[PDB]
Paper text:
MurD catalyzes the addition of D-glutamic acid to UDP-MurNAc-L-Ala, generating the dipeptide moiety L-Ala-D-Glu in almost all bacterial species. From a structural point of view, Mur ligases are three-domain enzymes that share a very well conserved ATP-binding site that harbors the Gly-X-X-Gly-Lys-Thr/Ser motif and display notable structural similarities in terms of domain arrangement. The N-terminal domain is involved in the binding of the UDP-precursor, the central domain in the binding of ATP, and the C-terminal domain in the binding of the amino acid or dipeptide. Crystal structures of Mur ligases reveal that MurC, MurD and MurF display at least two distinct conformations, namely ‘open’ and ‘closed’, with the position of C-terminal domain dictating the nature of the conformation.
Intermediate Bound MurD was co-crystallized with UMA and AMP-PNP in order to further explore the dynamics of MurD upon ligand binding. During the process of structure solution, 423 residues were refined. Structural inspection of Intermediate Bound MurD revealed that Lys198 is not carbamoylated, contrary to all previously published structures of MurD complexed to UMA Previously, complex formation between MurD and UMA, UDP-N-acetylmuramoyl-L-alanyl-D-glutamic acid (UMAG), UMA-ADP, UMA-ADP-Mg2+ and UMA-ADP-Mn2+ locked MurD in a closed structure, which gave weight to the proposal that ligand binding was important for the movement of the C-terminal domain leading to closure. It appeared that it was not in a closed conformation. After superposition of Intermediate Bound MurD with open UMA-bound MurD, we confirmed that this new conformation of MurD is different from the previously described ones, which was quantified by the determination of the RMSD values of all of the superimposed structures, both for the whole protein and for distinct domains. In the Intermediate Bound MurD structure, the H-bond pattern of UMA binding is almost the same as in the closed structures of MurD and as in open UMA-bound MurD. ADP-binding residues also occupy the same orientations as in previously solved structures. When focusing on the interactions and position of Arg302 in Intermediate Bound MurD, we observed a novel H-bond pattern for Arg302. Intermediate Bound MurD displays some features of the closed conformation of MurD. The hinge loop is similar to the one in open conformation of MurD, but with an additional H-bond to Pro300 and ADP, thus dictating the C-terminal domain to take a position closer to central domain than open conformation of MurD. However, the C-terminal domain does not rotate to the closed conformation, because Arg302 is not H-bonded to Leu299 as it is the case in closed MurD.
Author numbering: 1 to 221, 227 to 438
The structure:
């Protein structure tokens, strides 16, 4: 596209807004920038040449614009933006700017949970094939920074927020991995409005990769991945689990370094995207055998005396923990650590996994009582995670799992979920060896 002599206004001064400033300056277009916050985090980083307005939006700036570029952190529904829209001022985001310039195919990944896992893994499959792959987007490297004449494949993790402002994506392959209640402040009309944002990812996609077990991932009007069914699925038989693709065995899950049924379906989704993108199968399968997974994502920290200790500290929401529980095949007793800051979540969806004779809950942190209320008869409540671990550890037996998948933010007691996971891992080594 050509922005020569346009009046461009960028809203938001975080990573996105700055990558947009860089993008326009590199084309000799000088944008203006604003942010509703007085001192947004990217303010320091801004070139001195750039006019800026902080502490509020500048409506006269907005209304005089030829193009408004909106960071994903501000709602299109913002009264200032709907007024620009009503003035017929074009509004786009960074992903839109990106798709107009990109000269290599795009794999596009969205969904409530699993995005970074699946995005990373598709990158690893491309790397294993010797492809110059650009991985970025929501994962944390702003997409505009990936733009590179030598790049042969882009792999973009995309949020609902980014998809809302994007109209030219034509992905060689696109997925919604799953849809569970998230960011609901941004979606006052409820689960279907959140879902509808995500569904845009498929428009003009060459292959849609859908989740056979989650209807919400399907266009209302494909290739599928699934646990029991789908083009890409898992096949458990004679004591083994296999990846199946179009009815063929392609890999024994034992050859992967990932654990957890939902990580195996992530592996299937990634494989499906890589196949659609024309990556060689043999190298993609190879990436499945070498990929260790991201830290704190259902991450095995220790297997010893027939007990698996699993750090799923990144599970800060109900949907993540639910996926963890749903895929479990524990021979002995599950010891499940829950709690922290529940962010007013509804924990009911967890309860159906917590029946029968072989589950114990160890609930801690700010909202531990809400989590124990899931099933008080089998729940301990402590102040801290460490206390919970010192209660459960003397009880573990061969065949058991100890799972930290707390369904809650960690911010009431920890710096962040990573500290919580690292603390869990240290205790697990101490108490599990
Ligand atoms: C919330 C969001 O969409 N953030 C993504 C964004 O980061 P960036 O720093 O550009 O964020 P931003 O658009 O400035 O918004 C960040 C925060 O600033 C605030 N904000 C922004 C503009 C403004 O005028 N006033 C204001 O208060 C909003 O509260 C928002 O919460 O662009 C990055 C590159 O594409 C993403 O990695 C990053 O994902 C983070 C990890 C995230 O939390 N994403 C959400 C969507 C998620 O995964 O659930
Ligand atoms: N397909 C999935 N469904 C539900 N939860 C998942 C899935 N894949 C991973 N998770 C869990 O979700 C949390 C975040 O995983 P991650 O790959 O970082 O996703 P995201 O990038 O979408 O935040 C972790 O607890 C992880 O184990």
């Amino acid at each position: 596209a050509d922005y020569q002599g346009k009046n461009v206004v960028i809203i938001g001064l975080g990573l996105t807004g700055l990558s947009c400033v860089d993008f326009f300056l590199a084309r000799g277009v000088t944008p203006r920038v604003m942010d509703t916050r007085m001192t947004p985090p990217g303010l320091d980083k801004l070139p001195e040449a750039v006019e800026r307005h902080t502490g509020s939006l500048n409506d006269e700036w907005l209304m005089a614009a030829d193009l408004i570029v909106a960071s994903p952190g501000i709602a299109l529904a913002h009264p200032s933006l709907s007024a620009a829209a009503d003035a017929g001022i074009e509004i786009v985001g960074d992903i839109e700017l990106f798709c107009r310039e990109a000269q290599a195919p795009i794999v596009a990944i969205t969904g409530s949970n699993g995005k970074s896992t699946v995005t990373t893994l598709v990158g690893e499959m491309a790397k294993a094939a010797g492809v110059n792959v650009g991985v970025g987007g929501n994962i944390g490297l702003p997409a505009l920074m990936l733009l590179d004449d030598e790049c042969e494949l882009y792999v973009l993790e995309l949020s609902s927020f980014q998809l809302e402002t994007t109209s030219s994506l034509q992905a060689v392959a696109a997925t919604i991995l799953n849809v569970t209640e998230d960011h609901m402040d941004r979606y006052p009309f409820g689960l279907q409005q959140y879902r509808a944002a995500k569904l845009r990812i498929y428009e003009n996609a060459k292959v849609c990769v859908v989740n056979a077990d989650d209807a919400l991932t399907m266009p209302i009007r494909c290739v599928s991945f699934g646990v029991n069914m789908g083009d890409y699925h898992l096949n458990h038989q004679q004591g083994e689990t296999w990846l199946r693709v179009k009815g063929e065995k392609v890999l024994n899950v034992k050859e992967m370094k990932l654990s957890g049924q939902h990580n195996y379906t992530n592996a299937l989704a990634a494989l499906a995207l890589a196949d659609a993108a024309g990556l060689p199968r043999a190298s993609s399968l190879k990436a499945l055998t070498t990929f260790t997974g991201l830290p704190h994502r259902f991450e095995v920290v220790l297997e010893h005396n027939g007990v698996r200790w699993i750090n799923d500290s990144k599970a800060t929401n109900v949907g993540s923990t639910e996926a963890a529980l749903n895929g479990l095949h524990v021979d002995g007793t599950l010891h499940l650590l829950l709690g922290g800051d529940g962010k007013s979540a509804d924990f009911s969806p967890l309860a159906r996994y917590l029946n029968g004779d072989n589950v114990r809950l160890y609930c801690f942190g700010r909202d531990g009582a809400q989590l124990a209320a899931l099933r008080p008869e089998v729940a301990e409540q402590t102040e801290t995670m460490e206390q919970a671990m010192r209660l459960l550890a003397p009880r573990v037996q061969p065949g058991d799992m100890v799972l930290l998948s707390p369904a809650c933010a960690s911010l009431d007691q920890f710096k962040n979920f990573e500290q919580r996971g690292n603390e869990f891992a240290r205790l697990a080594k101490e108490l599990g060896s």
